Each structure stands twice: as structure tokens, then as C-alpha cells.
Amino acid sequence: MYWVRRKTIGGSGLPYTENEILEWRKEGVKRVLVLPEDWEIEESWGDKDYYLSILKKNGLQPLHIPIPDGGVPSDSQFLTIMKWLLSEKEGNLVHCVGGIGRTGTILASYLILTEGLEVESAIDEVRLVRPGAVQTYEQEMFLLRVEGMRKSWLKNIYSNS
């Protein structure tokens, strides 16, 4: 597990045991955004719902937003992901299978929206703590789009009464 922004947001891969989940807790993780698909989670936990219950049993609030390997969240999923990540700033962990591609893309997107970083800076930022972050062209294209649509995303994320 690695932090992109000390104790506010970090990434990791899929845990193999409950002890590894307790390691996240000791590190300061409090909320977990789960990105792998059901079948990927099941390789280590047998059942996706069981895994989510294990996260809750260990004091972590999870949100499952399945993204296919090598892909990116749909616009609807991205809205959900960002509303979730922005709801609480402390202890956010984002994870996929190994913590590189999908996770790196989401983390970079988070920096683009929250700090107004240009796509290249956001990518370098995540790669400094996680070599290989942002794996596919689709993910790279998605990030430039996030930068261009930054104002629109913020407006839609915070649309209130």
C-alpha cells in the first residue's frame, strides 16, 4: 500500500488475508474504494459480497465500483467515485488487483480535480509512489479528458439543493 497524499488518499492491490486488511487500518486507512470486477475479487475471497463484509467487519467502509482491467470508469461511475472520495478526506484507499493501472488512473484523476494539476503532472505524481501507474492509452486519454472537463465535473459533483 502507498500514499499519494499522506494519510488522505493512497492505493494498493487486492489483499490476500484479513491481516493485510488490518495492516491498512494501522496505516490510517478508513474507507476503501474497490475497483476490481467480481471475478478478480473472488480469486482471493471466493465471493465479492463476502469480501465487502470482511472490509466492514474490520472497520472499513467500502464502495464497490467495478472497472474492467485496462479500462476506465464510465462517466456515471466517475461521478459516483468522486462524490465518494470527496465526501471524507481522511484515510481513503483505492485498490484494484496490483495497485497499478486502474488505481493509478483514479488517483491521478483525483489530483487533477482536487489540485488542478495538468495531466502530465498528475501522472508523474502517482508514478513517483507507484511505478507503472496508468497503464493503457484509454486510461491516459481519460485523464486528459478529466483535466479538460474539470469545471464540469466539480459542478456536477456538488450539485445541491
Side-chain angles (χ1 to χ4, degrees), residues 116-139:
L117 301 188
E118 307 200 327
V119 66
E120 73 277 3
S121 296
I123 293 173
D124 182 67
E125 284 279 302
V126 182
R127 288 178 175 173
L128 282 174
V129 293
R130 161 32 72 187
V134 191
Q135 280 291 93
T136 65
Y137 289 133
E138 186 181 5
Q139 298 173 335

CSV table of all heavy atoms in Angstrom, one decimal, residues 116-139:
chain,number,residue,atom,x,y,z
A,116,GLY,N,-6.1,20.7,-9.4
A,116,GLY,CA,-6.0,21.4,-10.6
A,116,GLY,C,-4.7,21.1,-11.4
A,116,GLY,O,-4.2,21.9,-12.2
A,117,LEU,N,-4.1,19.9,-11.1
A,117,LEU,CA,-2.9,19.6,-11.8
A,117,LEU,C,-3.1,19.2,-13.3
A,117,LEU,O,-4.2,18.8,-13.7
A,117,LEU,CB,-2.3,18.3,-11.2
A,117,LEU,CG,-1.9,18.4,-9.7
A,117,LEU,CD1,-1.1,17.1,-9.4
A,117,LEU,CD2,-1.0,19.6,-9.4
A,118,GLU,N,-2.1,19.5,-14.1
A,118,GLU,CA,-2.2,19.2,-15.5
A,118,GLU,C,-2.0,17.7,-15.6
A,118,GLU,O,-1.4,17.1,-14.7
A,118,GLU,CB,-1.1,19.9,-16.3
A,118,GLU,CG,-1.1,21.4,-16.0
A,118,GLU,CD,-0.4,22.2,-17.1
A,118,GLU,OE1,0.5,21.7,-17.7
A,118,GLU,OE2,-0.9,23.4,-17.4
A,119,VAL,N,-2.6,17.0,-16.6
A,119,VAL,CA,-2.5,15.6,-16.7
A,119,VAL,C,-1.1,15.0,-16.5
A,119,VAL,O,-0.9,14.0,-15.8
A,119,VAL,CB,-3.1,15.1,-18.1
A,119,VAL,CG1,-2.3,15.6,-19.2
A,119,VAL,CG2,-3.2,13.6,-18.1
A,120,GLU,N,-0.1,15.6,-17.2
A,120,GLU,CA,1.3,15.1,-17.1
A,120,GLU,C,1.8,15.1,-15.6
A,120,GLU,O,2.6,14.2,-15.2
A,120,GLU,CB,2.2,15.9,-18.0
A,120,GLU,CG,2.6,17.3,-17.6
A,120,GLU,CD,1.6,18.3,-18.0
A,120,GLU,OE1,0.5,18.0,-18.5
A,120,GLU,OE2,1.8,19.5,-17.7
A,121,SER,N,1.5,16.2,-14.9
A,121,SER,CA,2.0,16.3,-13.5
A,121,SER,C,1.3,15.3,-12.6
A,121,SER,O,1.9,14.6,-11.8
A,121,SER,CB,1.7,17.7,-13.0
A,121,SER,OG,2.4,18.7,-13.7
A,122,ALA,N,0.0,15.1,-12.9
A,122,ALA,CA,-0.8,14.1,-12.1
A,122,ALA,C,-0.3,12.7,-12.3
A,122,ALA,O,-0.1,12.0,-11.3
A,122,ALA,CB,-2.3,14.2,-12.5
A,123,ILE,N,0.1,12.4,-13.5
A,123,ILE,CA,0.6,11.0,-13.8
A,123,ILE,C,2.0,10.9,-13.2
A,123,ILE,O,2.2,9.8,-12.5
A,123,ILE,CB,0.7,10.8,-15.3
A,123,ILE,CG1,-0.7,10.7,-15.9
A,123,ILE,CG2,1.5,9.5,-15.6
A,123,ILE,CD1,-0.7,10.7,-17.4
A,124,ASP,N,2.9,11.8,-13.3
A,124,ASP,CA,4.2,11.7,-12.7
A,124,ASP,C,4.1,11.6,-11.2
A,124,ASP,O,4.8,10.8,-10.6
A,124,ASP,CB,5.0,13.0,-13.1
A,124,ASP,CG,6.5,12.9,-12.5
A,124,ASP,OD1,7.3,12.0,-13.0
A,124,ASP,OD2,6.8,13.7,-11.6
A,125,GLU,N,3.2,12.4,-10.6
A,125,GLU,CA,2.9,12.3,-9.2
A,125,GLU,C,2.6,10.9,-8.7
A,125,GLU,O,3.2,10.5,-7.7
A,125,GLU,CB,1.8,13.3,-8.8
A,125,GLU,CG,2.1,14.7,-8.8
A,125,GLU,CD,2.8,15.2,-7.6
A,125,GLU,OE1,2.2,15.0,-6.5
A,125,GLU,OE2,3.9,15.8,-7.7
A,126,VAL,N,1.7,10.3,-9.4
A,126,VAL,CA,1.4,8.9,-8.9
A,126,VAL,C,2.5,7.9,-9.2
A,126,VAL,O,2.7,7.0,-8.4
A,126,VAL,CB,0.0,8.5,-9.6
A,126,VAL,CG1,-0.4,7.1,-9.1
A,126,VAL,CG2,-1.1,9.5,-9.3
A,127,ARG,N,3.1,8.1,-10.4
A,127,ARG,CA,4.2,7.2,-10.7
A,127,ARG,C,5.4,7.2,-9.8
A,127,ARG,O,6.1,6.3,-9.6
A,127,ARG,CB,4.7,7.4,-12.2
A,127,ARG,CG,3.6,6.9,-13.2
A,127,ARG,CD,4.0,7.2,-14.6
A,127,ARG,NE,3.0,6.6,-15.5
A,127,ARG,CZ,2.9,6.7,-16.8
A,127,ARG,NH1,3.8,7.5,-17.4
A,127,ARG,NH2,2.0,6.1,-17.5
A,128,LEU,N,5.5,8.4,-9.1
A,128,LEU,CA,6.6,8.5,-8.1
A,128,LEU,C,6.4,7.6,-6.9
A,128,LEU,O,7.4,7.2,-6.3
A,128,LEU,CB,6.8,10.0,-7.7
A,128,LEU,CG,7.5,10.9,-8.7
A,128,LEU,CD1,7.4,12.3,-8.2
A,128,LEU,CD2,8.9,10.5,-8.9
A,129,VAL,N,5.2,7.3,-6.6
A,129,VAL,CA,4.9,6.4,-5.4
A,129,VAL,C,4.5,5.1,-5.9
A,129,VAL,O,4.5,4.1,-5.1
A,129,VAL,CB,3.8,7.0,-4.5
A,129,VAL,CG1,4.3,8.3,-3.8
A,129,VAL,CG2,2.6,7.3,-5.3
A,130,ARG,N,4.1,5.0,-7.2
A,130,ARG,CA,3.7,3.7,-7.7
A,130,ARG,C,4.1,3.6,-9.2
A,130,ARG,O,3.4,4.0,-10.1
A,130,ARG,CB,2.2,3.5,-7.6
A,130,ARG,CG,1.5,2.5,-8.6
A,130,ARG,CD,2.4,1.3,-8.9
A,130,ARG,NE,2.6,0.4,-7.8
A,130,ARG,CZ,3.5,-0.6,-7.8
A,130,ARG,NH1,4.3,-0.9,-8.9
A,130,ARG,NH2,3.6,-1.4,-6.8
A,131,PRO,N,5.3,3.0,-9.4
A,131,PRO,CA,5.9,2.9,-10.8
A,131,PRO,C,4.8,2.1,-11.6
A,131,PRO,O,4.2,1.2,-11.2
A,131,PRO,CB,7.1,2.1,-10.6
A,131,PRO,CG,7.6,2.5,-9.2
A,131,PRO,CD,6.3,2.5,-8.4
A,132,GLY,N,4.6,2.6,-12.9
A,132,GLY,CA,3.7,1.9,-13.8
A,132,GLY,C,2.3,2.4,-13.7
A,132,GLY,O,1.4,2.0,-14.5
A,133,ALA,N,2.0,3.3,-12.7
A,133,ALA,CA,0.6,3.8,-12.6
A,133,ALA,C,0.1,4.3,-13.9
A,133,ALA,O,0.9,5.0,-14.7
A,133,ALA,CB,0.6,4.9,-11.6
A,134,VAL,N,-1.2,4.1,-14.2
A,134,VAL,CA,-1.8,4.5,-15.5
A,134,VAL,C,-1.1,3.6,-16.6
A,134,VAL,O,-0.1,3.9,-17.1
A,134,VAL,CB,-1.6,6.0,-15.8
A,134,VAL,CG1,-2.5,6.4,-17.0
A,134,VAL,CG2,-1.9,6.8,-14.6
A,135,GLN,N,-1.8,2.5,-16.9
A,135,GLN,CA,-1.3,1.5,-17.9
A,135,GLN,C,-1.7,1.6,-19.3
A,135,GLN,O,-0.8,1.4,-20.2
A,135,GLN,CB,-1.7,0.1,-17.4
A,135,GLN,CG,-0.8,-0.5,-16.3
A,135,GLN,CD,0.6,-0.8,-16.8
A,135,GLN,OE1,1.5,0.0,-16.7
A,135,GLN,NE2,0.7,-2.0,-17.4
A,136,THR,N,-2.9,1.9,-19.6
A,136,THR,CA,-3.4,1.9,-21.0
A,136,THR,C,-3.6,3.3,-21.6
A,136,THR,O,-3.7,4.3,-20.9
A,136,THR,CB,-4.7,1.1,-21.2
A,136,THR,OG1,-5.7,1.8,-20.4
A,136,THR,CG2,-4.5,-0.3,-20.7
A,137,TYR,N,-3.7,3.3,-23.0
A,137,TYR,CA,-4.0,4.6,-23.7
A,137,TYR,C,-5.3,5.1,-23.3
A,137,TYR,O,-5.5,6.3,-23.2
A,137,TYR,CB,-3.9,4.3,-25.2
A,137,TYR,CG,-2.5,4.0,-25.8
A,137,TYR,CD1,-2.3,2.9,-26.6
A,137,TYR,CD2,-1.5,4.8,-25.4
A,137,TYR,CE1,-1.1,2.7,-27.1
A,137,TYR,CE2,-0.2,4.6,-25.9
A,137,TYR,CZ,0.0,3.5,-26.8
A,137,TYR,OH,1.2,3.2,-27.3
A,138,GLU,N,-6.3,4.2,-23.2
A,138,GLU,CA,-7.6,4.6,-22.8
A,138,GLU,C,-7.6,5.3,-21.5
A,138,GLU,O,-8.3,6.4,-21.3
A,138,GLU,CB,-8.5,3.3,-22.6
A,138,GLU,CG,-10.0,3.6,-22.4
A,138,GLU,CD,-10.8,2.4,-22.2
A,138,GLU,OE1,-10.3,1.3,-22.2
A,138,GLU,OE2,-12.1,2.5,-22.1
A,139,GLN,N,-6.8,4.8,-20.5
A,139,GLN,CA,-6.7,5.5,-19.2
A,139,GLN,C,-6.0,6.9,-19.4
A,139,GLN,O,-6.4,7.8,-18.7
A,139,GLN,CB,-5.9,4.6,-18.3
A,139,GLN,CG,-6.6,3.3,-18.0
A,139,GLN,CD,-5.8,2.3,-17.2
A,139,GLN,OE1,-4.6,2.3,-17.2
A,139,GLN,NE2,-6.5,1.4,-16.5
